[PDB]
Structures are given as structure tokens and as C-alpha cells.
Amino acid sequence: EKGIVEKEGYQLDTRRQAQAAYPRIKVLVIHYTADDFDSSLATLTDKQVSSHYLVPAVPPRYNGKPRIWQLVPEQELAWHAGISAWRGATRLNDTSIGIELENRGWQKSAGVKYFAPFEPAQIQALIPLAKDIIARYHIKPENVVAHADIAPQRKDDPGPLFPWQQLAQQGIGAWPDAQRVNFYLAGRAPHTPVDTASLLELLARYGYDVKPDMTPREQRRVIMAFQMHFRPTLYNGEADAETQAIAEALLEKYGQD
Amino acid sequence: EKGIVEKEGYQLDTRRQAQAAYPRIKVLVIHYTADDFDSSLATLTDKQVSSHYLVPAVPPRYNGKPRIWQLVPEQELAWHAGISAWRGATRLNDTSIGIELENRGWQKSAGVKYFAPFEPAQIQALIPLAKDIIARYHIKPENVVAHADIAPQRKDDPGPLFPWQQLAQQGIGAWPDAQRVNFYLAGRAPHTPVDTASLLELLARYGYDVKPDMTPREQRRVIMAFQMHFRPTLYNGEADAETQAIAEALLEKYGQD
């Protein structure tokens, strides 16, 4: 009958549905390819790495719409996150969708690591795709993340030129309330030094992989990753009052779950 | 055209498929309900807990087939594993399917914890369902597990009367090769005491949650959980030569991945 599924050696009665049923997909990870489109496509379809989506630097338009490549069905995991951790989860491939953005990433120029700006055409294509994914799985804003957020010791992508605040204004990803940032500054100048351990606690709670007995460099990488996402005007990895205030405002607004 | 999916604000080109694409579902967890069918169904459809499937103690037959209840679509997680760990993963709800077996579990009788046998009708219904799930997601034999295997400090289910060897003979779950068990015994009587730490290392590698500085009781719970699954004639949690030999033979056959 209705709600009865015939199988080989048994039948399934589907008439009673549990309330506790949730998506396995909880996180959306943003990457850059550090490579041109064709080479990125070749890599992302090889035996070692993949992503669910690949967005050209300037997507071609057909039928009045930008074209985006889908390489892996969303129901399956892609191999995009590697060793990773976010808000208490590990193995983020298992519970994420990975979007690759064609973009050069960083290139050293007189020794300075300089990042490549994202073209507006690419961001404008990304926006509806991201909104569709977020709506489909009820992804929380704090779970739209940089690869660097989940693997801070290893990765920088999508880096300090990625327009997170713009995307937040369009309903994609977390951003603190300006008045609350000012509140947590508590009269301090933005670059006033802060107890490093105090900041690392906040970042651990927001979701960054923080362990006991980290070296100074490891400590710097976590703070830098956070700054690249949320305080991109200065990502030297040094704990200051503004970086702390942003973490405090994020935690107040989005919690730790 | 073919391989082009029209969306709102973009289109998807699905013509190039990545090779690195795998199921998000990797583990099949077996439970008992410790409750009658109707009460189990009520619980498993409430706000706090659920499973993908619920198998009656003696399934009713319609169309010459046993009926099994499905409560959660496999694409979604159910809330069946709780705090858990297996072969380096945590949060096993995310990457598992949970099957609940209607069965009383344990009941104390003159203080002795006695388990309830599984009726052959229930096991015979379980077999084709398990084979279908395993085939669908390419689940490895070592990843068909007891709830107790993934939460040894908290759970005993499905307990020492669950017929794992019988299921292994039907292609469901891991079981060591008898000749290899004898080989790793290395001339020792089965109950000869073994260095507890030596056994805990093997269990950690097989996939059990083993931490540094565990108390004697915590150590006993991990060994007991292992024995309930693989050496059910004696599950006192004491390290002996037979328990070690089984762990050694399992590791040789199935590895750690």
C-alpha cells in the first residue's frame, strides 16, 4: 500500500517518520584553486582531490545566466578539506560541501605575499549557488567557512581579499554587529595588545582548532586565519583589542554549537 | 542541453565528474531498544532520539516477506549514536545508519546481568536489509559495529548474545580467521593473562576509543565491549591471550582505515 516499499527478502513500512532527522551536510567550505580553469578542472577530477563545485573567475553566460561546474553529487563527499576541524567536528569532508573558486591566491612580489582580488562576476555567480545550498540544508551562518578556518596551520584560502562582509549582507555567512564590536572594544584603541591566551580561548570556542602547548608560530597561524576572514586589514597573527572584540561579538551573536 | 541544469541566477554544468566521490555513510550501527515495539516506536519518533530502522522481535509477514519500519531517510542523520568514536571518527550520527532491534537487552536476576536472546525471525529479517545497506554504500566489514563498540563507556548493545559470527558467514561484519587466532595465541592457553596496555593498543588501532590515563574501570569497559562482540563466552574485561589473539587476527585481516 501507500508507505510500503517492497524489497528483496523484506518490506519497509515508511508511514511513521521520526522528528529527529537532520542533514548530514552542515558546513559550506570556500576555497581558491591557485590555478587556471582547465588545470583546476583536471586536478579536481583526478584521483587525489575534488570539490562539489568549480566557479570560473569570470563565468561564461548562457541563457542570461553564469555557468558553474558541478563535479560531485552533493549526497557524496568530495576530497577538498583534508585534515580539518571546525566547532568540535573533524574530517570536514564528511559533513561539508566544497566550492572551489578559480583565483590565483597568493604570489610573492619583492617577498611580500600579495593576494589576487575576486572579480565581481565570480562573486555574483557564487551568491545564488551559496544561498541555494544554505537553504537546502539549513546551514547556519557560522558554518560558511574558509578552508583556512578549518585547517589554519596548512591553508590560507580564500584569503584576505574574499568579500565576506558583502556576502553576509546578502545572507551568506556570519558577521558581527558593528555596535557590539565597539562595545567589546571597551574604550581600547583597536591595536592595543591583548593577552594571547585570552584570544585563543575565544577562537577555540568560535570553532578554530586550538590545542594545549601550541608553539608561538601555531598560535600566530590560528589568529592570522581568523583575521584573514574577519579583520582582513591586518592579519599579522598578533592578538589585539579589535581582534578580541570581533571574536566576542561573533560568539555573542552565533554561539558555539 | 544534456548535462546542463538550469537554476535561479545560474546554471550547472554536470558533464565532468570527479573520480574522488564517496558515500558520506561509512558505518552501520546495531542497537537494541530495551523496550517493546510500540514504546520503542514512540521513543524513536520523539524529539530526543531516532534511528533509521526498527526491526520487530518477530517481524510480521506480508507478501511472504518480514516487515521492517523505516523512520528516517538514509540521506539524513538519525540521533542514535550520541557521543561516540570509531576508527578516528567522532560524532558517528553524521556518517552512520542506525538499526534498532526490538530486544529487552539486559535484566538483573539475582544480581547477575542476563541478556535476552535474539529470535531467529528477527536475524533473518535483518540479514537482507543489512546486505542492501552495505552494498549501497560499500561499507567495509569492520564498520558494521555494536553501539558498545563506538561508545564503550556508556553502552552494551546489542550485547553478548547478538550472533555476529553468523552474520559474518553471510557477508555482514568482520570476523577473524580461526587459524590466525590460533597462530597469535602462540602456544598460550586462551585465558593466560596479558599486559593490559598491550591489548589496549590493539583495540585503539582496531577503532575503540582509548585515551591516555584511563582508570582501571574505563580500561575494563573497552576490553569488555570488545569481548561482547568478538569473544562473547567471557566478557569480564580482563586482558587474556585469546582476547589479544583475536585483536591481532582482526588487525591483520582488516587493518585500521
Ligand SMILES: [Cl-]
Ligand atoms: Cl585547497
Ligand SMILES: [Cl-]
Ligand atoms: Cl587539504
Ligand SMILES: [Cl-]
Ligand atoms: Cl541505545
Ligand SMILES: [Cl-]
Ligand atoms: Cl546514545
Ligand SMILES: [Zn+2]
Ligand atoms: Zn582550500
Ligand SMILES: [Zn+2]
Ligand atoms: Zn544503542
